[PDB]
Symmetry: C5
Subunit: 204 residues, 5 copies
C-alpha cells in the first residue's frame, strides 16, 4: 500500500502488456459507487481508463473513452455514453457515479456534469474483481487488446462505495478529495506489470 500523492502512473508506450493491477479491500457486491481520476493522454483512438472484471463477466464495470469528447460507462456489459466539449489534447479530471436504485450514471468532466444516463437499475456489480489500469480486460485479469491500451498518465484515482454529492466531486477535482474506501490514491494496493513508471505529477 503506497501513498502516490503528487504522483502519476506513466504508461509510456503502446503495448498489449503494460498494466497496473489494482487491489481493493472491498469484498461485497456494489450497489453504489463513485470513481474519480485524472488522465493525460494524446491518443485519438479508443482506450480503456478503468477496467473492472469479475469471474465469467467481462465489462462488469468499465470506463471507456471511445473518441474525443465521448465517455462510456459499462455496468454489467450494458453501456451508456455521454458527450462533452473538450480540447485535444488536454489533461482531464473524470468522475463517474452509478446508483443501482435508479440506474443513474453521472459523468463529471473537470467538475462539469454531463447529461445523466441510466442503465441496469436494480443490478449489483459483482465482488472479488480484477481491476486493471492501462489495458482493457476481456477475461478475469487478462486477454488484453493493444488497440484499447491506455498510453499516457493517470493520477489521483479514488473510488467510493456511494454516490458522491456535487460538492465532494468538485473537491476531488480541486485536489482535496475525501478519503475513499474502495480505492484510495494515498493508500493504494497495486502491482505494476511491464513498463509502467511512477513520476511526479507536473500537469495540474
Amino acid at each position: 500500500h503506497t501513498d502516490l500523492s503528487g504522483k502519476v502512473f506513466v504508461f509510456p508506450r503502446e503495448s498489449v502488456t503494460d498494466h497496473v493491477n489494482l487491489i481493493t479491500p472491498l469484498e461485497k457486491p456494489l450497489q453504489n459507487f463513485t470513481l474519480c481520476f485524472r488522465a493525460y493522454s494524446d491518443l485519438s483512438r479508443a482506450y480503456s481508463l478503468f477496467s473492472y472484471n469479475t469471474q465469467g463477466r467481462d465489462n462488469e464495470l468499465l470506463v471507456y473513452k471511445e473518441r474525443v469528447g465521448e465517455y462510456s460507462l459499462y455496468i454489467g456489459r450494458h453501456k451508456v455514453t455521454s458527450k462533452v466539449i473538450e480540447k485535444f489534447p488536454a489533461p482531464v479530471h473524470i468522475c463517474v457515479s452509478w446508483e443501482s436504485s435508479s440506474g443513474i450514471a453521472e459523468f463529471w468532466i473537470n467538475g462539469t456534469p454531463l447529461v445523466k444516463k441510466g442503465l441496469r437499475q436494480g443490478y449489483f456489480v459483482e465482488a472479488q474483481p480484477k481491476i486493471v489500469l492501462g489495458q482493457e480486460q476481456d477475461s478475469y485479469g487478462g486477454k488484453f487488446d493493444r488497440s484499447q491500451s491506455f498510453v499516457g498518465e493517470i493520477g489521483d484515482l479514488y473510488m467510493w462505495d456511494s454516490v458522491l454529492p456535487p460538492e465532494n466531486i468538485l473537491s476531488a477535482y480541486q485536489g482535496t478529495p475525501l478519503p475513499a474506501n474502495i480505492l484510495d490514491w494515498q493508500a493504494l494496493n497495486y502491482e505494476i506489470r511491464g513498463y509502467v513508471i511512477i513520476k511526479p505529477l507536473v500537469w495540474v
Copy 2:
C-alpha cells in the same frame, strides 16, 4: 401536485415508451401563451421537447428541436423555425411565446431573442390537451416515435396563458419566474410512465 424546485426529470435512455404526462386544467382555447423550460441533452438527432396534441389534432402545439441551433414551433400543424448560435452539448434555457392576433412566435434562448416568425394568425390552439415530455405524440396521448424521443434532463418548466414581456422572460431565465397558470414547476401535476427518474438539478 408536486413542488419540483431544484429538481429535473431525467429521461435516462432512448425508448418508445418512457415519458411524463403533464396535467393541466386547460379548458379554454389558447389565444396567447408563453412556455419556458430548461433542457440538457447530448442527442444530435431531432427530438420533441414539448408535445401537446388535442382530439383529432396532431402537432397542435409542439416544440421540436430539428438539429443543433434550430428550434421549431408547431401551432395547429403549421411550423416556424428559428436559428441561434449555441454550443453542443450544452444546457439551455428555452422560452417560446405565441400570439394569435398577430401570429407572432418568439423564441428566447438563454435570455436571447431569436428572429420572430409568424403562423396561424387568428387561430386558437385547442384545449383539453394531452401534454407529454420525453416523447412526441402522433395521436391524442400516444403513437410515440423512438427517433423523436427526448433523452436527457428537463427542469424549470412554466407555461402562462399570456405573452410574457422580455423582463419576465429574463426573470424566468435567471430563476425567478412569474407565477404561471397553465403549467407550474413549483406545483406540477404529472404522471411518470416508464423509465423517468427525478433528480436534483446539478447543471445550473
Copy 3:
C-alpha cells in the same frame, strides 16, 4: 406618418406577397445619399434589404444581401459588393452611402467601415421611386420573387440626401441618428401589404 421609435417591421414568413411600401417626399434626382437601418434575419439564402425602382428602371438603388458576410449595392443596375466578418445569425446595423461625383460606395457594418467600392460616377439615381421592404422589385412597384423575399425584422431606417461622415454613421449606430430628409423612422409614411407586423424592438 408614424413614429416607429423602438419598433420594427416583422416580416414573419417567406412569401411573394408580404411587403411594406415606403413613401418619400423627395422628388429630386439623387446625387448623394446615405441609408441606415437595423436588420435581424436568419435567412442564409440571398435577399433584398432595400429595393428602390423607378419607371422602366430595375435595381435603380438596391441593397442586396447575397450571402453571409457579403453586402451588395446596386446603383442604376450596376453593382458593387463588399465583405465583412459577421456572426450568423446576428442583428446587424447597416449604413450605405453613395456619392455621384466620385462614384464611391461606403458600407458600414455595426459602425465598421467596409472596403470602399465605386460605380456610376457622374450618374443621377432617378427620382419618383417605388421603395419596398420585404420584397425585391423587378418592375415599378412589383414583380416580386419569393427567393429574394426578406424574412425577419427591420428597424431604425433613415435615409439622407447627403453622404454622412463617419461621426454621423457612428451616431446613428449608437442610437441618435441625425434628422433625415428622405426617409425617417420617427415620421415614416408607409403602406403595409400582406403579412407584416409592427412589434417592439427587443434585440437592441
Copy 4:
C-alpha cells in the same frame, strides 16, 4: 508633391487600367530598403501591392499577396514568401525590408515580425524605376493584368533607403513614421491614371 496625411488612394474597381504611378528621383541602385504602407482590401485572389520595374527587368522589386496569410517579396525576379495569421477581410499595416549584404528579407505585419527569409545576397536592385500602385507591371510602366489588379485602399506609404530597426517599424505602424527619402506619403509625387479616388482614411 502632395501631403496625403489622413488620406488613401481608393482603387474602387477591378480593371486592367486603373493605377497610380509613384515618382522618385532615385538614380542610385538600391542595396538596402524598407517599405511600409497600409492596405484594406477584400480581394481573395492574388494581387500586387507595390510593383517596381526597371527597363527590361520585370519584378525588380515586388510586394505581392498570393492569398490570405501569405506575403511575397520579389527582388530581381527572385522570390521569398512568409506566412502570418490574419483575419479576412481586415485592414493591415505592412512593412518589408531587404538587405543586400545578407540577402535578408523581413516582413512586418501589424507590427509583428514574420519569419525572416533570404534572397539575392550581394545583388543591387536597379534604379530609374517605374513604381505603380493598383496594377502589376510586366513591362517598364505597363503590361498590366486584371487578375493581379489591386482593389481597395492604400495609405501611409513610405520608403526608406535603409533597413529600419524594429523601433522605427513600430513607429510607422503606430502612425509616427520617420521621414522617408525615397517615397513619402506626406510629400508624394504621383500620377493618377483612370479610376482612382483620394478619400480620407477612415479604417484606422
Copy 5:
C-alpha cells in the same frame, strides 16, 4: 566563441547545404539530458530541429517536427511522438528531456508539459557526436535531405547532461536559463556552413 545572447541563427532558404555544426567536447555517453531552444518557422512540411549523429549511428538523438502540433524525439533510432495545441505559424520554445533509467521523454512546449512517453530504457546515447542545425543527418556529419531542412530562425539553445525539473524548464522559457554544460547559447562553439545569417532576435 561566442556569446549569442539576444541573437538567432537565420536559415533564410530551403537547401540541402545550409547548416550549423555545433561543437562540444562530449566524450561520456549520455544517460540523462535536457535540450531547450527557441524556434520560428513557417514550414508546413516535416523538418529536423536538432540532429545528433554518431559514427555508424543515424538518429542517435533527434528532435523532429513531423507536422504542426506534433513533436518527435528519436533516441538510438527509436522514436516517441507527443501532441500539442499550437497556432501556426508561431514562435515556439521547446524543451525535451530524456532519462535512461526510466526511459521517460518529456516535451515542454512554451512551458507546457506534453504527455510523457518512454523509449530505450537502460540505453546510453553515444558520445562524440556531430550536432547540426538546419539539416537532418543520415551519416556522421552529412547526407542531408532538402525535404527535411529547417527554414527559419533558431535561438536560445541550451543542453544539459541532466533532467531539468519543471522550475528550471520555466526559467529557460522565461529567458533566465541555468548555465548548461553541453551546449550553451552564451558560449557557443559553432561552424556556419553555407547560407546562415546571424541576426538580432526580434520575435521574443
